[PDB]
Each structure stands twice: as structure tokens, then as C-alpha cells.
């Protein structure tokens, strides 16, 4: 019938030609229109193995978003190895749109429909499709935004070849809103989050981590250090690069005590000088646009790392993670794999 295979996919989207927004422009020139009536075929009685940590669709998605950003962003200066490149830097229109990934003739995409599938191993409920669901290429660290939710339980995704894992992806079954604003100094911003809603979800995440890690006490602590892009919740809002301090989000005492309810206000900064997530160096952008800058997003997942080097009798320590944007694509492509007919 079929075998595991890799091939060059193509992309589809609902992008609009009249729009100056850069994802639309890229998609208009790089993708075809979506299928109005997509087809899904259940594979009666098939058990298939998946491995989200060995999925060439992830590399392919990465190539796309790199190409997208490299065509779309206009930094004033680019510092890339050994060079300094200067260019015009007009402000752009920026808001990610869903992209579907589709297989060419002779191939199909298998999809895992098990509700508590963790991304690796056997799947009992399998269907075949021509295209993935629409996936927004949101680039962020620590918190996964505007993505999909787990259908049933909270899910912990991690490769299990070793206890020395890299990223641990938490997939939430309930989204939590994050309201980030630069009011109308000019680079000071803040993110507002409903504290009672967040601490409820984070307590559930904690109990799932406990379940996963031999029932030990779960402790959060801040990021070890390194680039601001990973020590902070980093993301792009309306073209502007935001850096938000999340220490208040990972507050162990709020799992009852006082002051844990009500609005959580994270301090944020807009930065012109960034380390490129593409890993190629640094870029400088122009000062923030005037007016009220605002992005409201779903938190749909959390990127974590687990401290490996300290004695653990009764506890495990986790820190917010991210920076490798392939983990972002993994959080959405985990249920898919390409096979050849």
C-alpha cells in the first residue's frame, strides 16, 4: 500500500492579492488557493507509527518561514557574518495567516486522530488527507500563540531516547488570552493576563508534569540566561519586536494565597536591535510606529526545559524555553506524516 517517504510539499492558503500584509503577499506568490471541499479518508483498522521528532515537514515549514521573513522584513541594518548590510527600512503590515501543507501526486498525508497522542508511537485512529489544517507561522519563545489546542487532556511532548531532552512542548486544552499593549518610553509596553484563569491552567500543567515525571514535586524557575529572545517571552506584534518578562507567570506560590487572583501585568519592551531567530546574526529596525500598538493572542502551549544537572530526590525544575523555532512547527505538525503510494 504505502511506505514512509519524504517529498517536496506545496502550500495552499486563502491569501488576498489586494492586501499589503506580508504573509498575504508571500502566500499570494508562493502558494495556491485552498481546496474548498477537502477530503479525509478514514483508514479502517490501520495502526500507524508516528514520530514528530523525525518529521521532514518540520524542516520544510522552517524553510518557508525563513524565506517569508527574508522577503518580508526590512531591517535598517543587518549584521551577518563578517558583514554589515544597510537598506531602507519602511514600516510594514504584519499579521500571520494560516498556511496549509499539501502533498504532490503519488503521496498522501497520514493524520493521527487519537485524542491523547503525544507525538511518538502508534496511532489507532488514522485518516489520510491531501492537506494539513491551516497553520499560522507564529514565531515566538516561551509561549506558543494562536495555535491549536489539545482536544482532551493537557499533553506533554518530548522525545524519549534519553532523559536528557531538549525542549519539552506542553499542549494546552484550554487557551488563555494575553493582551499586550504599547500605549499611545515609546518602547515601554505591557502584557495583561487574567491571573485566576492562568494559575488554574498552570496548576493543571503542573499536575500533568508530576504525572509524567515519577510523581515528583514540580518547581518553575526563570530562564538560565542567554539571549533576551529566550530569557523573555519574545514575539512580533504589528511588525514590532516585543520582549516581555514572564517571572510573574511562573510563580510557584500561586499553586491558595493572596494577590494571585486579578490581572497579571508583565513588563515589556519593544527593541529595534534583535538576534535573528534564523540564527544568522543580528538586525536593527526603526523606532516603533505611532499610536496604540496592540496584539491579543491565545496562549495555546508552553515551551519548557528541565534542569538536568542537580540532584532530584523529591523534585524536578523547569524553566521557560524556546528559541528553536522548529519546536514551534512541531507543536502543530506532530499529528501528520507523509507517505508514498
Amino acid at each position, epitope marked *: 500500500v504505502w511506505k514512509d517517504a519524504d517529498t517536496t510539499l506545496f502550500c495552499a492558503s486563502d491569501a488576498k492579492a489586494h492586501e499589503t500584509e506580508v504573509h498575504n503577499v508571500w502566500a499570494t506568490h508562493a502558494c495556491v488557493p485552498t481546496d474548498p471541499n477537502p477530503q479525509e479518508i478514514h483508514l479502517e483498522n490501520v495502526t500507524e507509527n508516528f514520530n514528530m*521528532w*523525525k518529521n521532514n515537514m*518540520v524542516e520544510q515549514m522552517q524553510e518557508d518561514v525563513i524565506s517569508l521573513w527574508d522577503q518580508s522584513l526590512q531591517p535598517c541594518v543587518k*549584521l551577518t*557574518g563578517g558583514s554589515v548590510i544597510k537598506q531602507a527600512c519602511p514600516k510594514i503590515s504584519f499579521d500571520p495567516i494560516p498556511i496549509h501543507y499539501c502533498t504532490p501526486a503519488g503521496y498522501v498525508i497520514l493524520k493521527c486522530n487519537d485524542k491523547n497522542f503525544n507525538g511518538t508511537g502508534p496511532c489507532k485512529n488514522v485518516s489520510s488527507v491531501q492537506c494539513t489544517h491551516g497553520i499560522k507561522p507564529v514565531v515566538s519563545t516561551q509561549l506558543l500563540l494562536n495555535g491549536s489546542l489539545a482536544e482532551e487532556e493537557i499533553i506533554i511532548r*518530548s*522525545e524519549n*531516547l*534519553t*532523559n*536528557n*531532552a*531538549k*525542549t519539552i512542548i506542553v499542549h494546552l486544552n484550554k487557551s488563555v488570552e494575553i493582551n499586550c499593549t504599547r500605549p499611545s518610553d515609546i518602547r515601554k509596553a505591557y502584557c495583561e493576563i487574567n491571573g485566576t484563569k492562568w494559575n488554574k491552567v498552570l496548576k493543571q500543567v503542573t499536575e500533568k508534569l508530576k504525572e509524567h515525571f515519577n510523581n515528583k514535586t514540580i518547581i518553575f524557575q526563570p*530562564p*538560565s*540566561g*542567554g*539571549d533576551l*529572545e*529566550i530569557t523573555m517571552h519574545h514575539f512580533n506584534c504589528r511588525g514590532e519586536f516585543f520582549y516581555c518578562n514572564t517571572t510573574q507567570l511562573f510563580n510557584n506560590t500561586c499553586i491558595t494565597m493572596k494577590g494571585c487572583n486579578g490581572t497579571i501585568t508583565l513588563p515589556c519592551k519593544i527593541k529595534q536591535i534583535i*538576534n535573528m531567530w534564523q*540564527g544568522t*546574526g543580528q538586525a536593527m529596525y526603526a523606532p516603533p510606529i505611532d499610536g496604540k500598538i496592540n496584539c491579543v493572542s491565545n496562549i495555546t502551549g508552553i515551551l519548557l*526545559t528541565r*534542569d*538536568g*544537572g*542537580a*540532584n532530584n530526590t523529591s523534585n524536578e525544575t523547569f524553566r521557560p*524555553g524556546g*528559541g*528553536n523555532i*522548529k519546536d514551534n512547527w*512541531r507543536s502543530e505538525l506532530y499529528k501528520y506524516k507523509v507517505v508514498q503510494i
Partner: antibody, heavy 122, light 107 residues
Framework: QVRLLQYGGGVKRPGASMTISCVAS????????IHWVRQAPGQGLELMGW????????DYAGAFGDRVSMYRDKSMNTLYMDLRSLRSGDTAMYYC???????????????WGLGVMVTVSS | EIVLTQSPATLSVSPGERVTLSCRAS??????LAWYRQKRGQAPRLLIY???TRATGIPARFSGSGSGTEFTLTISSMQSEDFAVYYC????????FGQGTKVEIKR
């Protein structure tokens, strides 16, 4: 053609802090973690901690809790390790080592630097 | 805090002869075990990873095997360059090393 060239060896004074370093080449600097491993005379190899050069995340051995820092200059393919509050027990060979990984895992070591000798005394 | 025990600490073997080295873990490490060699004035060198896979450039006289908590490194026929110190390493939980086995020349 991987190479990890090391610097910073020599005599250090007790109570002081030292910085040693490692210059990497022959591969994509962003794609491999680097581990710092030391061997004290008459003792076994011991991992001090690792750094992921892509973003600078680190993870340290608890036995070196407060005293160690690892960081890097990406644009120079250069890795640094600080060790503070030096004592005589810190007299050791210090190695820069690159670590093989997968998408989600950290595995064995595939290239060691020649190492640097540190001697702590007054 | 996974402890690797390499005993005996010293092995005396005549050139051209067979040697088997032992590594015992205090706890299961799956097959996440590697072997390194260290000669005088040289950096440690990877020989074997994943318990039984030879690294690039390593001749076929080197062999690794093992399950659970007991692993071996065997050299089918000892060469001149083979007399050295050998370390096992697990990377199942953090990274830890055995204390080493020195293989010396028997005369």
C-alpha cells in the same frame, strides 16, 4: 573538519575567578551544544555543564552551583567559562567538548578539545 | 548520580592479544553508553556510542556490546596505539563517567 581550540590555562590565585575559552570551527556553530568537562589529577572526568550556542541556554552541575558561568560570542564562534571562588581542588585539566544531538535529545560526545591546564595556588 | 564502575582499573595484555573491558552502571541507562580513549598528551577520542556503534574512523577490531547495566568494550587484537586509558560514559541521565581502565603492556 571540526576543531575546538582552547585558551586560558595557567596559574590562578585562590579566591580569584578565572575565564577560559574555546574557539570553534569547521561546522555550523549553532547546531551543537558544547560541554565543559574537567579532570582533577587522580580523579575522574566530571561534567561542569553545557551551553547551547544558538541562544545561550545553559545547564550546570549542582556541584558547581553558584560558581560557574557559561556564555558565548556568536559572531566570533567563541565560548567562555567563568569559575569563581577558586580553590586548590579546582586544579585540573579543563576540556571544551561538542555534544551530538537530535531534534529533541542530547546524546554522546564526538570531539574533544586538547584541554587547558589550570593550577590554583598562592 | 548514576555511577559507572570500571573494574579492573588496570589490565595487562600482551600485544596482538584480545582484551575485554567492563562497565557496570548503578542503574539502567538503556543503550546510552559511549566509550572513549585517552593517550598521553592527547584529547579523549570517541570510539563507540549507543553501546555498539563504532564512530567514524574507528577500526573493526573495536567492539562494543551490552544490555541494561552491564556493558563491554572488546579489542580483538591489541595494537601499539591501543595501550591507553579507556573511559565509559552514560548519557541517559545527565552525563557521568567511569573512573577508567588502563590497558598496559604485558611482558
Amino acid at each position: 573538519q571540526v576543531r575546538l581550540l582552547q585558551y586560558g590555562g595557567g596559574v590562578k590565585r585562590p579566591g580569584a575567578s578565572m575565564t577560559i575559552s574555546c574557539v570553534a570551527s569547521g561546522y555550523n556553530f549553532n547546531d551543537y551544544y558544547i560541554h565543559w568537562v574537567r579532570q582533577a589529577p587522580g580523579q575522574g572526568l566530571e561534567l561542569m555543564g553545557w551551553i547551547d550556542p544558538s541562544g545561550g541556554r545553559t545547564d550546570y552541575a549542582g556541584a558547581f552551583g553558584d560558581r560557574v558561568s557559561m556564555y558565548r560570542d556568536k559572531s566570533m564562534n567563541t565560548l567562555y567559562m567563568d569559575l569563581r571562588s577558586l580553590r586548590s581542588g579546582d586544579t585540573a585539566m579543563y576540556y571544551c567538548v561538542r555534544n551530538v544531538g537530535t531534534a529533541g535529545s542530547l546524546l554522546h560526545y564526538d570531539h574533544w578539545g586538547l584541554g587547558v591546564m589550570v593550577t590554583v595556588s598562592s | 548520580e548514576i555511577v559507572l564502575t570500571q573494574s579492573p582499573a588496570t589490565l595487562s595484555v600482551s600485544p596482538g592479544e584480545r582484551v575485554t573491558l567492563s562497565c557496570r552502571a548503578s542503574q539502567s541507562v538503556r543503550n546510552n553508553l559511549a566509550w572513549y580513549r585517552q593517550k598521553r598528551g592527547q584529547a579523549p577520542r570517541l570510539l563507540i556510542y549507543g553501546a555498539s556503534t563504532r564512530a567514524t574512523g574507528i577500526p573493526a577490531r573495536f567492539s562494543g556490546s551490552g544490555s541494561g547495566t552491564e556493558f563491554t568494550l572488546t579489542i580483538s587484537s591489541m595494537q601499539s596505539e591501543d595501550f591507553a586509558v579507556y573511559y565509559c560514559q552514560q548519557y541517559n541521565n545527565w552525563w557521568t563517567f567511569g573512573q577508567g581502565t588502563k590497558v598496559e603492556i604485558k611482558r
